[PDB]
DNA sequence: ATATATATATATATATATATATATATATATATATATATATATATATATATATATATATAT
DNA sequence: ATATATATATATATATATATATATATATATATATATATATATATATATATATATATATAT
């Protein structure tokens, strides 16, 4: 759609005014706010009970009274936390549900921004090229439905693997150097740690396909079809394909627990390797350690 | 490192004042500049000869003269391009070498930002949770050096592949619907187009 | 028996002087955003007293 | 067993005190645009030096 060339400037002019991230980054206090917020959620992404959040944010505010150039309050950091953690809720950076705060997508993106300024993990690498190589191999073999081509690909692949098995039974096995282990660990972190990035936008999409429904059930002050057509159908009445239909199939991957257990055990083994602690700092080795649990329990 | 809890605010206070991307996003003109630059480099990223860049930027500026909200004038589009395409160079968003301009990293990141505000491709997809599965498998089989484990895992993998081949020869073909082909194509694009970012 | 070394004339390259347009740097004025402060009202929580409903006991 | 006394708790009214929300004013700070001034680059005409090419004169 080449009318995008004109629509794009309007899109950006609107975004720079509304989207919470791009409003946050332009204020004269974005660094302080982002440093505080990252620290809050830095150690758990399941959401924070409100009282513990108040405690942690109040302690952090005291930790950054070194920036009392902004008159950071020295009297009662708990009251200042009560104020800041609500200012950030009315600004839609954080949202509190079921008694626990969370970080909306509009803060996920913003934090993805600043922490990629200085020292973002390397993407152009050996591991990324190998992974896209293999994925391009796999996707192509799955589209063209010709069975002869499929069986030929399986035959060539199994014969190629036979070479590796024969050479592995012998003593010509080779393993990664230290730096290559570091690189693959960094890569498989930079893939896995992205799965978590869309939940808080799937929820935003569902909480938006509902208003666009009750704003029509109430505009149809005279009509019935747009209600019975839905209710008589047992299908999800709030179905929202553009994200709902993607996320759902991902559940039909998570609940194949047999593979998830293998993933969890493999992650258990990798993080014990000597080179792991050099590739990833402490926090990264925590988040990547708890992936399966903090995916299922999200 | 625990001292990160304090060093982080200093790091950010420095970044918000120096990094070209953040300064650019903070200004009152960021949307127009970002749209212009994206349009420039969008069609073909190989470096842009300077004269063609002037041509394209001058043509684009014409399609925004009606935006009086930022005092866009009409006297001479080519001179305006000649002015601001270097105003950007002195701001380190673009750098000209060997006669061609380029987009420094401090603009790669910024464009990765605004374009990912609203309609970014999904990362929480079945394809990604198959790719990380297989990659974890490969990394595990490659790190632990015990040859017995290697031969055992190769044997199990080759036997699984043999089962797949036996079922495929029997005509038990299974292929992606469109619903899944779209997602896999989107994923393999969102991986491939990241190689160039560095 | 051959070109070679020279003068003559031509053509081009290089420097000087001046006119004109554009870029860079500095300084002032304006608009925007933030922060505080003021002022008001609302909302919330706690203390005391009163009135109602419920729970348990003794007699019927 | 049903209805009658005697505690116990619950619910409402009234009042005090604190914190939050809202609205507005004003101050201050910050970013951007405009105005002014001076330096740099390009073009034209003229003069001067160097090189190139051609014409006769030469001990090879």
Full 3-state SS string of chain B = CCCHHHHHHHHHHHHHHHCHHHHHHHCCCHHHHHHHHHHHHHCCCCCEEHHHHHHHHHHHHHCCCCCHHHCCCCCCHHHHHHHHHHHHHHCCCEEEECCEEEECHHHHHHHHHHCCCCCCCCCCCCCHHHHHHHHHHHHHHHHCCCHHHHHHHHHHHHHHHHHHHHHHHCCCCCCCCHHHHHHHHHHHHHHHCCHHHC
Which residues of chain B have a CB within 8 Å of the CB of A135? 131, 187-188, 191
Q: How many CB atoms lie within 10 A of CB A287?
A: 18
Whether B19 and A117 lie within 8 Å, measured CB to CB: yes
Count of A-B CB contacts under 8 Å:
234
- Cα–Cα distance between B114 and B34 in angstroms, integer? 8
From A222, A290, A283, select the one nearest A43 (Cα to Cα): A283
Closest-lying nucleotide for A86 based on CA to C1': D20
Whether A12 and B34 lie within 8 Å, measured CB to CB: yes
- Name the resolution in angstroms: 3.7
Experimental method: cryo-EM
The first and second tokens of residue B102, run together, are 């380029």
The distance of B67 to chain A (nearest Cα, Å) reads 10
SS3 A25: coil
- Strand D bases, protein C-beta under 7 A: 19-21, 30-34
Residue pointed to by tokens 């063209």: A144
> H-helix or E-strand containing A101?
strand A100-103
Scanning A34-93 for CB atoms below 8 A from B yields: 34-35, 38-39, 60, 63-64, 66-67
Confirm or reject contact between B182 and chain A (CB < 8 A).
no
Is the sign of the CA dihedral B67, B73, B79, B82 positive or negative? negative
């Amino acid at each position: 759609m080449e009318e995008n060339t004109r629509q794009r400037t309007e899109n950006y002019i609107s975004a720079k005014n509304q989207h919470p991230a791009w409003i946050l980054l332009a204020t004269r206090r974005a660094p302080l706010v982002l440093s505080c917020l990252k620290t809050l959620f830095e150690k758990s992404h399941d959401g924070i009970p409100l009282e513990e959040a108040i405690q942690s944010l109040s302690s952090i505010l005291i930790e950054h009274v070194s920036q009392e150039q902004y008159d950071i309050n020295q009297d009662n950091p708990f009251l200042q936390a009560s104020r800041e953690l609500r200012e950030w809720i009315k600004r839609r950076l954080i949202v509190e549900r079921d008694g626990r705060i969370f970080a909306t997508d509009a803060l996920e993106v913003a934090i993805t921004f600043v922490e990629s300024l200085d020292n973002r993990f390397m993407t152009s690498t050996a591991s990324r090229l190998s992974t896209v190589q293999r994925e391009i191999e796999n996707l192509e073999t799955r589209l063209n439905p010709n069975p002869a081509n499929r069986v030929a690909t399986l035959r060539r692949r199994i014969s190629e693997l036979e070479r590796e098995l024969q050479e592995a039974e012998a003593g010509h096995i080779e393993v990664l150097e230290t730096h290559q282990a570091v690189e693959h660990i960094r890569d498989v972190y930079n893939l896995a740690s992205s799965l978590r990035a869309d939940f808080r936008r799937v929820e935003d999409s569902w909480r938006e396909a509902d208003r666009a429904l009750r704003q029509s059930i109430i505009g149809e002050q005279y009509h019935r079809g747009d209600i019975v057509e839905r209710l008589l159908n047992d299908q999800d009445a709030l179905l929202n394909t553009p994200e709902g239909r993607v996320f759902d199939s991902f559940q039909q991957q998570l609940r194949q627990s047999s593979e998830l257990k293998a993933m969890s055990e493999r992650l258990r083994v990798i993080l014990s390797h000597p080179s792991a602690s050099d590739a990833l700092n402490r926090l990264q080795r925590h988040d990547l350690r708890w992936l399966v649990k903090r995916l299922v329990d999200e």
